[PDB]
Design a protein around this ligand. Structure first.
Ligand SMILES: Nc1ncnc2c1ncn2[C@@H]1O[C@H](COP(=O)(O)OP(=O)(O)O)[C@@H](O)[C@H]1O
Ligand SMILES: Nc1ncnc2c1ncn2[C@@H]1O[C@H](COP(=O)(O)OP(=O)(O)O)[C@@H](O)[C@H]1O
Ligand SMILES: Nc1ncnc2c1ncn2[C@@H]1O[C@H](COP(=O)(O)OP(=O)(O)O)[C@@H](O)[C@H]1O
Ligand SMILES: Nc1ncnc2c1ncn2[C@@H]1O[C@H](COP(=O)(O)OP(=O)(O)O)[C@@H](O)[C@H]1O
Ligand SMILES: Nc1ncnc2c1ncn2[C@@H]1O[C@H](COP(=O)(O)OP(=O)(O)O)[C@@H](O)[C@H]1O
Ligand SMILES: [Mg+2]
Ligand SMILES: [Mg+2]
Ligand SMILES: [Mg+2]
Ligand SMILES: [Mg+2]
Ligand SMILES: [Mg+2]
Lengths: 370, 370, 370, 370, 370
């Protein structure tokens, strides 16, 4: 059986095919020491990965080797896969085909470089790469739908109808978990919590994943926050400091619908979604107002689905069955879908083999991999 | 018992002989994918037919393999019969003689090619082809009359008297449901509804079949539309958009009487009808001002019969019994007539047999088939 | 003397009648601030036009008020004419009749609204609107020809014979400079150049207008680009970044002949042209294979005329004198033609006057304006 | 005429509006006695300010009530304004509107508390607060630029284009005169000069402001200092001790470009500047590689501008007009700008009045003050 | 095996590596005669060391050649090592590598001079110097912690996390056993015990090391001493005089938390500790509120750990696991740690060799020694 890796921008997710739940999950980041290891007595190393990285942030600089789905640092990137194979899953990569994922319309160079690394350094027997949305759709068995995947690095809308892509209406957005965290960090610095080290950035991420939520009406909840204590929940900073976060718990996520606050010209996810639907033929729009499938951790806010519902119903003509699907498997949907795909017999012919790569090398992927 | 297929230009109609109602009806069109089927997991196909085609327009290009009664794409055409036999009626074509239909004066090549396909690929035991008008006349039992058949592809006038054809006065016209739909599409694009994909073309057809009607006086109803809301009915586009169509609901059908609007030099159906009557001997004109029988879906507009009545009475001398017959079976008249013909015992000698075709092949048909 | 404005979808062109060259040219766009003007000391404004807009893209959102020849934003549209009169040409609109242009079969509402604005707010003494193709034909003095006008917003084919229109064969296409720019933006994002702000969109337009060209054989030049450096010219992004564009320099324009790449079902300009010719009577087709006149900036690619020649000669029967005319005045042809028309004495009776509009208002235009 | 106070983190600067030069300058610090005043005969006091503080350091503890632009000690802070009004300028605060300044993105509480103090205790008639960068830009009349302000407490980069802020690209850094002094104190303690009382800290500041300079190449000048006397200039400690400072004269300022030496993860001013430029749209980057305006005393090192030039030109693409502007008015630029702003007539409507504050109190400022 | 010397400011501690207990301990002081040795008959000498010095204080002047970790008198300093090698341990220094210790941030000159003396005059085969805190941490095996070392000459706080130093948060204080003894001498002189010869100073040290203790509440125990006999313990001066010491038994040590009494501006050890913790990143503060390790004889007061606990818990946020570790090995911790370090095999490559010193001399140490 093959092996599935999502290579999520923010947190790698990996496991054996045919499993409904990912075995291994960890932050797709590396740790580099910035301080002198003068305590010779200990077996220190120049690099750290995942959990170890999280445990040592204050010693380390943190770098995300994936930005906006772009591998900007191949050397450190290799360590993520290296750890995933040799330490985490303890799997010989020569023994299994492997599946990878990428952002749509991602720069063609990187897919080649990725394939090169897989076939050369890990010497995998066979390989394939799929667009995340397709897998995430398989995770719900539907074959008519529109996917919002919103990982740490990108948010993109892909329509799929009866198993066909409509690439002319693929649309992507730079807003994602990372930049949303950056904005949250900014507004928190109107309180004393000014953070801004790469170490503290990761703690803001935790705070967001714990305590943020999406308002059904921005002016309503802003009024309530101006006029009540009740929103101003506490949180325990690791040093035991008590931070109180008010409207910011929602004023941040609001960016996904009014990105102008974040100074991005591109519209929010809802508006982009409507645009993409409208870019498709009128023959299909019905089914694409159904089957709005959320995916990825940025869809893990509470309330977000309701806001999307309300906005889309405000944009669509009435008497249209606007329906949003937000399964609780959202955070692992991509990997679930990949696990499903790898089990199909017919798909077993889809793999690119060692022989094929040897025949034409990386360029071959553009001919079959989608 | 034999089997009857109309092979209508726009929608195939098929069933067993001796039935007063056609069993199977579907659009005589094929669907070709234009977009990549990257969702391997699903069992997609390269071709679609009829209902499936209608259900997937936005994925597909649509092609009518019949134009103006001419089979321009024999390969895709074969699929229509193929579906009709094997899926729709679930009938072995070796077990039944089959009846087909054609436009009058249709190009002699195609009748041969059709016969070749029937006897070679479907290997039918016996075969015959009849001019649509004759069948449509049998559908009303009359044997003195003049038929207007106006399918999707052609409109033609055939007089028949006491069972005899008058081929010297056969007259055909290129105006038909398809080109009338095209014109309707044009004028709608003076509003925002500009459509013009092959997918949307089919929706214009539905709109026409739902909402168009024929004016008894063009200047009258144009004045009223200029001076009232009441004509400007709504329609629900499949995407839930609300389109409001005004005078266009009739300004389109008007083309059948003033084709100059459509830029065709040939006169309208009424004028052509009068011309054809006048081309016959004065011995018969009486009976041919009676027994104007409408046929085919373009005669399915409301009001059309009244307009024809008024025009013909304006052309004919007064004190002539201009009478128009518009049975509600219009839309299926051709197939009804064919079903009737196939039941006659004497007609059972009319069939061309496997033996006869083997004797002389396709050319044989010109000797007996009319 | 009257005044001529093209109101081109992408760039307004204006000047006095009787001039062979347009006096004033600027992008028909408005600029809206998205960022806070906290530097009170400066006299900022809420709106910007043309050159000012180009100079401030990074501050501004850009909106084209013309899409597909449709004025979708009348309020901002008014500013374009307002600037054109009061700042650019410095002309009192009460002192001169004015000529405007529109796409063929453009939605009838907008012509009325335009006339209303001209006679009410600008209070022009007299007014007329002409279809762009007719003017562009006058620009070459011919009176038998077929025009391809391909502005930023639309591309449409109009045949004209001896001064007569054949509206039944008018055909329009949504492909135009804007959507072609969008496609170019897409494929560039396979390299790192992902752009996609409304500001950067305008820079892609410049890049296209500088560096794109049409292949005489797609597979040939694709092979060469796969097998040579020589196509991969450089360009200097305004930030000094060096972008290298390869096959994309032509793979984009190719869309005009294989729009399926752009996911539009409608055929390319060549195929549409052949269709339109075939829609005309055989009496005229000879002259319409001559006198293929290019117009508008999308015809400003190098090589395009040759590709059209080769395609049309592949579609037409041989021994037909396929001839294409691509004067270097292409980019200003429409305005040139308008300048010519306004000088004719007989045309001076064609104008609609203040009196006439007062008599019947906007609806009057449909009776005389073509 | 209004009155302008910078409330600089390290040294208050104050004077009447419309003056090109600040009237009053003194260190924004308070002095508290730590030793018993047993010499009753003298009129001692529990508090000292500015010059008096400087004259008595050895008796006193010194506290900066401003840290990182944050007023951490409002009680002692009040004395700074109190002295400024009543002793220094000898001005009744009821007679003049007053202007104040703050760090960008400074914690929202403090702006309110400041306004409260101004309107309640000083009972000023009207008040306004501006971001330092904006004023410093007005000091050079430019309206396109990027400001580095680097006071004692903060260093922050703000881009401004044509008078518009781009808050999404505002970036701040904790490195500033104070912490740089602390580092200098540290390395001097590798020689005998170990200082580290709050009194001696102030003398290190003087030494820095007299004798430090920025290297154009760190390894070059380190080599020269390892291989020459010539850098090892003398200084006269107030007790007459002779201190010799070598490479430290530059190894300290180097921190602003390699803060890792100071153990801050955030990059240097140059890198941050490039990041901020890149955060702006490509429409404006050209003008922001021009008009790099230095401000505040940390930009008062010799050589710093050249180092910035070299670094930025190393980061920017070549053929970009990297230009740095370092007017000799740097040390007073903020106050100059404020003096200019207060003279503008239109700005006279910008003030918040006693009435407005009474209407809504401190919260009002967030609605108008930027 | 190598040899370990602490060169403690107040008492040298020396022995062979790999021993858990130091072999040799004596006061790091020299004795110089001030009185005429007229009793020729005896073999007197001009110098005395350690025990001999203690036995002859009344004849001698005593000088500490180490002050604040600074070797101020290299000539007399040499005798300490000279005695340590040749008399005390009876070891040839050519036969063993030797380890030394220094205060953090100690003036760079002295480390060089020390190395020079070791390699030149003692001609040791190999040498290394380590910061005291690191060794003292190894003495407890921990590798996350913060060390308070408080010898006779200095008290300094060093954080270490997972074996990494955070030099940016190293902080040192001049308060130490010597100056605390001086203060105790002062307050005793409010009783008759005015001492103040360099001889008597040493007896005050003994009294302190015997009879002082730290109050858990200063005002509490001051009240009790004002209201009870019970604190006023006796001591036997060497001349048999009976001295009674009351609150002074604690009013002295209190200086370490309220140094203002000693007229030092720098805060106490607790406050400095909190400051240092706060100077580290929030990623690590948790572990640094644990693992407060005491070291050196000034941590040998009873009660001190409890006072530190109470203060730190008063400064830290509650629900933080403030834990203090005060092993009874405190007084010898540094030497224990050094003994441990010298046994590690990997450390055996850390030594500087005779060859290396010969290559570059003293300056070499700054490249490897930490
Ligand atoms: N409960 C949550 N609430 C808000 N944001 C979350 C939550 N869980 C995860 N996230 C965000 O989603 C990111 C991961 O999303 P994911 O789809 O896994 O991206 P990728 O697939 O590229 O790793 C996290 O880093 C975080 O920013
Ligand atoms: N109710 C209706 N109103 C107007 N047009 C109709 C209606 N019903 C059918 N049509 C037109 O008639 C066409 C079919 O006519 P038909 O006689 O079946 O042609 P064919 O026999 O060649 O299939 C339809 O495609 C449509 O354009
Ligand atoms: N040299 C060129 N090469 C390619 N495209 C061009 C060139 N010049 C102009 N264009 C395209 O043509 C557009 C303008 O064409 P135009 O006919 O003026 O449209 P309109 O008349 O509606 O303004 C430009 O915005 C650009 O997209
Ligand atoms: N000539 C100089 N060289 C180096 N540093 C200087 C010089 N002059 C001033 N400084 C530093 O700049 C600080 C004051 O800068 P300033 O911009 O006034 O800060 P603020 O505006 O917050 O008072 C001084 O305290 C000192 O540290
Ligand atoms: N039991 C004790 N109580 C109080 N102070 C002590 C005690 N033991 C030692 N000291 C103080 O600690 C000093 C020695 O501490 P130490 O850490 O050895 O300094 P160094 O390491 O520099 O020699 C002694 O000189 C004395 O002042
Ligand atoms: Mg993912
Ligand atoms: Mg039919
Ligand atoms: Mg134009
Ligand atoms: Mg300042
Ligand atoms: Mg010691």
């Amino acid at each position: 059986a093959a092996l599935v890796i999502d290579n999520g921008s923010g947190m790698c997710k990996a496991g054996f095919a045919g499993d409904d739940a990912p075995r291994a999950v960890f932050p797709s980041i590396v740790g580099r020491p910035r301080h002198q290891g003068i305590m010779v007595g200990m077996g220190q190393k120049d690099s750290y990965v995942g959990d170890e990285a999280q445990s040592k942030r204050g010693i380390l600089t943190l770098r995300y080797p994936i930005e906006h789905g772009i591998v900007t640092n191949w050397d450190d990137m290799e360590k993520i896969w290296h750890h995933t194979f040799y330490n985490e899953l303890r799997v010989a990569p020569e023994e299994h085909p492997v599946l990878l994922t990428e952002a749509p319309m991602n720069p063609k160079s990187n897919r080649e470089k990725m394939t090169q690394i897989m076939f050369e350094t890990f010497n995998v027997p066979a390989f394939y790469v799929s667009i995340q949305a397709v897998l995430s759709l398989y995770s719900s068995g539907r074959t008519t739908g529109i996917v919002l995947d919103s990982g740490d690095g990108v948010t993109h809308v892909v329509p799929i109808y009866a198993g066909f892509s409509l690439p002319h209406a693929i649309l992507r957005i730079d807003l994602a978990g990372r930049d949303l965290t950056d904005y949250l960090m900014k507004i928190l610095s109107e309180r004393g919590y000014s953070f801004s080290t790469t170490a503290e950035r990761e703690i803001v991420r935790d705070i967001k994943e714990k305590l943020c939520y999406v308002a059904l009406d921005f002016e309503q909840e802003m009024q309530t926050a101006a006029q009540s204590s009740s929103i101003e929940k506490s949180y325990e900073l690791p040093d035991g400091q008590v931070i109180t976060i008010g409207n910011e718990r929602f004023r941040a996520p609001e960016a996904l619908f009014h990105p102008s606050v974040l100074g991005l010209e591109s519209a929010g996810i809802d508006q982009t979604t409507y645009n993409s639907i409208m870019k498709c033929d009128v023959d299909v729009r019905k089914e694409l107002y159904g089957n709005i499938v959320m995916s990825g951790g940025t869809t893990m806010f509470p309330g977000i689905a309701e806001r999307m519902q309300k906005e889309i119903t405000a944009l669509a003509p009435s008497s249209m069955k606007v329906k949003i699907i937000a399964p609780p498997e959202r955070k692992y949907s991509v990997w679930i879908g990949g696990s499903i795909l790898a089990s199909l017999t017919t798909f077993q012919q889809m793999w690119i083999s060692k022989q094929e790569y040897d025949e034409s090398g990386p360029s071959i992927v553009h001919h079959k991999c989608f």
